[PDB]
Swiss-Prot record, chain A:
This is DNA damage-binding protein 1. The keyword Membrane does not apply. Protein, which is both involved in DNA repair and protein ubiquitination, as part of the UV-DDB complex and DCX (DDB1-CUL4-X-box) complexes, respectively. Core component of the UV-DDB complex (UV-damaged DNA-binding protein complex), a complex that recognizes UV-induced DNA damage and recruit proteins of the nucleotide excision repair pathway (the NER pathway) to initiate DNA repair. The UV-DDB complex preferentially binds to cyclobutane pyrimidine dimers (CPD), 6-4 photoproducts (6-4 PP), apurinic sites and short mismatches. Its main location: cytoplasm. It is found in: Cytoplasm; Nucleus. Residues 13-356 are annotated as: WD repeat beta-propeller A. The lineage of its organism: Eukaryota, Metazoa, Chordata, Craniata, Vertebrata. One of its GO terms (cellular component) is nucleoplasm. Keywords: Acetylation, Biological rhythms, Cytoplasm, Disease variant, DNA damage, DNA repair, DNA-binding, Host-virus interaction, Intellectual disability, Isopeptide bond, Nucleus, Phosphoprotein, Repeat, Ubl conjugation, Ubl conjugation pathway. GO terms for molecular function: cullin family protein binding; damaged DNA binding; DNA binding; protein-containing complex binding; protein-macromolecule adaptor activity; ubiquitin ligase complex scaffold activity; WD40-repeat domain binding. The chain holds residues 1 to 415 of 1140 of the full protein. One of its GO terms (biological process) is negative regulation of reproductive process. Belongs to the DDB1 family.
UniProtKB/Swiss-Prot annotation, chain C:
This is DDB1- and CUL4-associated factor 1. Belongs to the VPRBP/DCAF1 family. The modification Phosphoserine is found at residue 16. Ubiquitously expressed. The gene is DCAF1. Acts both as a substrate recognition component of E3 ubiquitin-protein ligase complexes and as an atypical serine/threonine-protein kinase, playing key roles in various processes such as cell cycle, telomerase regulation and histone modification. Probable substrate-specific adapter of a DCX (DDB1-CUL4-X-box) E3 ubiquitin-protein ligase complex, named CUL4A-RBX1-DDB1-DCAF1/VPRBP complex, which mediates ubiquitination and proteasome-dependent degradation of proteins such as NF2. Induction: Up-regulated in a number of cancer cell lines (at protein level). The protein kinase-like region mediates the threonine-protein kinase activity. It comes from Homo sapiens (Human). It is found in: Cytoplasm; Nucleus; Cytoplasm, Cytoskeleton, Microtubule organizing center, Centrosome. The chain holds residues 813 to 879 of 1507 of the full protein. Component of the DCX (DDB1-CUL4-X-box) E3 ubiquitin-protein ligase complex, named CUL4A-RBX1-DDB1-DCAF1/VPRBP complex. Interacts with DDB1; the interaction is direct. Also forms a ternary complex with DDA1 and DDB1. Interacts with NF2 (via FERM domain). Component of the EDVP complex, a E3 ligase complex containing DYRK2, EDD/UBR5, DDB1 and DCAF1. Interacts with DYRK2; the interaction is direct. Interacts with RAG1; the interaction is direct. Interacts with LLGL1 and LLGL2. Interacts with histone H3.
Amino acid sequence: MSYNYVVTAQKPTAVNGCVTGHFTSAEDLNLLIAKNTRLEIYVVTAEGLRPVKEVGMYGKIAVMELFRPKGESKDLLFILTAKYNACILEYKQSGESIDIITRAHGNVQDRIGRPSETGIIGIIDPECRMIGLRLYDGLFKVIPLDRDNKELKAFNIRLEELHVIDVKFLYGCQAPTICFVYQDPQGRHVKTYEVSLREKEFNKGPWKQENVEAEASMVIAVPEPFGGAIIIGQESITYHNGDKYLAIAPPIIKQSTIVCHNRVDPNGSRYLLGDMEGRLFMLLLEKEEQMDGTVTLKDLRVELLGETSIAECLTYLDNGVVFVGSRLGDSQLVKLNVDSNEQGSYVVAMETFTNLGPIVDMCVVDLERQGQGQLVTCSGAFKEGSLRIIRNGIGIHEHASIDLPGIKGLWPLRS
Amino acid sequence: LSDRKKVTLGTQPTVLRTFRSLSTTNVFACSDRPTVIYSSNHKLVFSNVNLKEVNYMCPLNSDGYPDSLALANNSTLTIGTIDEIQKLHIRTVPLYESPRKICYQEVSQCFGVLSSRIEVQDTSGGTTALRPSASTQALSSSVSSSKLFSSSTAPHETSFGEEVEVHNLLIIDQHTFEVLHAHQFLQNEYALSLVSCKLGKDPNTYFIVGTAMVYPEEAEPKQGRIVVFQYSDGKLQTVAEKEVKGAVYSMVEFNGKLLASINSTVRLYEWTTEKELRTECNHYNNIMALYLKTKGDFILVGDLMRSVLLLAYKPMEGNFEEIARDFNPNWMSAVEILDDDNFLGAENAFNLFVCQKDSAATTDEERQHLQEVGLFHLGEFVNVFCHGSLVMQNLPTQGSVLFGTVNGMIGLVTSLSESWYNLLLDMQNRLNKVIKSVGKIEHSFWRSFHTERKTEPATGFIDGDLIESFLDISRPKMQEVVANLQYDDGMKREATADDLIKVVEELTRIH
Amino acid sequence: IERVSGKPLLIGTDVSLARLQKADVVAQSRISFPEKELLLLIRNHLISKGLGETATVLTKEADLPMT
Amino acid sequence: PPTLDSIITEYLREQHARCKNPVATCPPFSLFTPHQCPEPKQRRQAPINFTSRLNRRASFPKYGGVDGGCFDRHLIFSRFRPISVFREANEDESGFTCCAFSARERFLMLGTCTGQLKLYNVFSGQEEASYNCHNSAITHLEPSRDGSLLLTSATWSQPLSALWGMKSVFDMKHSFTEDHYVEFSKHSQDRVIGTKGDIAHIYDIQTGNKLLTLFNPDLANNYKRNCATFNPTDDLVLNDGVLWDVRSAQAIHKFDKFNMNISGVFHPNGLEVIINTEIWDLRTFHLLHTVPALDQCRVVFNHTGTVMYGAMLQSPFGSSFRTFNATDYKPIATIDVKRNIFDLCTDTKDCYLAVIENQGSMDALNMDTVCRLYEVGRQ
């Protein structure tokens, strides 16, 4: 029969999801870039990035998120593969021995069901009590986060609503609750629920939001001071906290779809937003100290910040340093200013990272008639389109030509 | 001192030095196989240089090369420095628009890149771009003419400038990589295939661009043309054109004839003397013929939904012929002929498989059915396949197929010998009990062929990236890999440590 | 028609079912607008219909962008 | 009296009523400009053209965009082409009744009017092995996936349905004299269910005894053509349009009758129940949908369960086909087959349609019922 042999020449470079936190130690911020199957563990330093341990896993890392459960100084990491094989990890260091230990695992797949249309969505509860998953288009898998799972137990609480667009956990409101963006057959809206782990069933949700924008795309839950939800759409930005509401449709967010977001400030004071054309925005929030203890929202601002590569990651690190991860080419690390430049951008370019991107065509070609060939790959996408030339070895080609064959040595003389 | 280990360098005495290139204390191996010892993604793995033979080095002080060193040989003296040390040195030529395909001229020194520019439509003027890409900023430009799609009233007027696409043919310089020339096509004309070959006894070497006419709010297109270009003396020229009803998806050269693939129809051409084309034959049993690969006189077709398809060409009969066909509905992504018996294909379900032309042709039904020999979950979407190694031809395995994906993962697929298959596959099942993978995932479970309906366990292929990890395992655990096993040096021997690690290094030098 | 749908309170308007869920949302919407968008229209009316000796007095109450 | 606050509010609301897809928490309005609510301009959706999806899937995941595989199924099930027609050249005119494929897709088990099934190679087109199965005719004929069993049911013969054997020895390995329509169990095939009238019997294959007969006299719909089936989780039975939990022999929920003939079927998602033209839920029991093009048609799904096939059972029978989607039930195609469709079976590997069509006019005295194989997805 036919027998063949498969290796990896270039490790996969395009990134898929980026999570910050404290995964290595107690008091050290770090970055966890998953690309296709690799899980890179950097650390945030005063000069830039510094790798610690790269781990290749068996599967496409689809959903990852850090979480610190009540009882551990350090935190843990949940990773779900493309073949639905879930795991919970923990960094452990002892001298030169640096190891990753799986704390719980177990395949979580139903026998029957259409997978998805919006892909796989996974959200960690803010109080670290459960782990939600949208997997099979009509169910909401709940993994009860406890030490009881030597292998991961699972529930399947039925979503009565079929075509769910995005889903998050809302922040601290004494009970773990869920937000949606659901496409009705006639319209679309935002409904809520409340999971009872002891009864495996949805309780009554506190919000109604009977009609939101016709292309609402994501939910951004705002934290513990003035909790709520921001529903970014194609043409407008809303806010809801049960009673109050704001809405802006600024003329900046008109020409491109917001696709990524992160929480800049820990009290939700700022929010970056990227799009499908390269632009970074910043959704400012005006904190209104209305009463002696009341914290409410007052205004919604959108400030253009400049052009980067087409982002799919978006992570704010520290000291005004933002990491931009690009599937479509040239993931780069950027710096946000205070004042502006000649173009009004605050985005300072720093060191980049080479991505071979979506390769769409190749040709193996030699340009020095040698025994070694070069490979020109059509890399990148819309504005990140670039030919990339790939060679083995070390390219000493800027060399002086001196006719001295078989000489024994050349030694300096100075004054 | 620790244990020793033999590394092959050559047949002459070698030199091992270190120096300061610009900084960071680089280490070099002056040998017949000259390597840089110092780093390979922060790991002690050798990586070569682009020099044939290095004997000595010399710390000079060049006025045009700061802190560089000269290299004494049995040949010339090269004052050179060393950049960031890695295996795969990558150089970026940005174009600021999406590249579609790439070809190569051997006679002329120029590439050929089809590309895609996003433009919005102006009210008074025609259109406008959004950024000064490397399409408009060229040394010369041109425009498509001879409006032969003028009778159709299909281009209706649009309301707003809602991001139409404009494609062109970038011809890029060989050494400077400056864009020499671009050629804008017709309005709403995509370009989907590019080959550059010679057709007939005409001693020119052309460009052939297979184009199609697209319209939104529409199904599959039925318009388009195939245009033959040439680049005589820095000037792109439109020689011929051939309006063809249907989108031209993939082209290959086939024995001095241009083979096409035009909306589930495989149409062979023939270059006449009068700068035109005459259709030689056709094939029709196709859902949507999206791919073509040839070797000699056989033709490999990758269908939209069905599979690998093998199609003959009998030149004495003047037509085609169906040799065989796989029946299992795999959604194709990329195909490539391996060795005129085995055929490799890619799938939307992120998988690989090899089909085989059958041997025991006891009837006509058992020889029109291709057999799937081998299944594997390369968990990554394969776009491209190509021949050609990346290492030096020193004149093992047989052949070398690289592939190009959507995450920048290049890998190598090559053909083994039937003895070393059972050698390595017995090593994997021993290695699948030693290395505890992160996540507690069985390697048999991950590499298993997984469509929407089949979960057959993986066979036929050797996952080399697990076997290359044997080099990192310590000897108190490598000894448990070396069980009571076999070794073929017709003869028979129990397995040992120092020879199984020699096998992997014979594989690691492929890549 | 009233019972199985979004409760029209005995108004004969847009009796079709697709047009009935339109009128529920349009009537229950929260229309708001700033004071500027009216006062600039008030001033541009009063200057237009001759009665102008409150317009320069309306500048005392609010900013006036256009003379 | 009103104020200008109320007048400008009502003026905007009468302009807000022109919004296709209006909102609730609207932005602050602008009196100087018109007001248009944001219409859906689809950017994440895959393009309508196929070549535009083909260029996009080269730099984007599996299909190209949101709802990309749906467009790939519109272009690929809206075209069919007849490859081969299988006559019955023994008494010069065909007498076929029922059609199906084998478990290995090489042979296709047609079924005569006389009560015998005749094998035919899909490549050759040759009679290979006839089998004296029934006295009356062949009504229903399905094999098992492992290729060891075969269920055939007859028209009026005194044993009505027979579990034959197809490994290498052909014998009635269990006999039934009662049921008009037998059917396997889907996932674990060790159970065979069958239905006479309104009474449905669960049988084993190993011993053939009555496992559990389920019927509630207080609750039946009394459909004309009752056919009890299983869900793909092998836990629910649609007898008389009533669900049945097979763990403890109880009824769950009667449905509302509407169409006098068809007792329903399960959709392969395990989420719905398809009564004749009413689409139901399995856990909330709410009428989700109503497709009026499903008016009295027998339904056949793909093996993946991604498309629904439709053949009219209206007197003529089946003047065309009916190609449906399994997710949103949007009609893909109605290809016009000029003859009368009597039966319809499809491949496991999605390449052929077994179509029993009747030649001549609507003649109950002379029936020339041939089998015509189509090819999926070819013009």
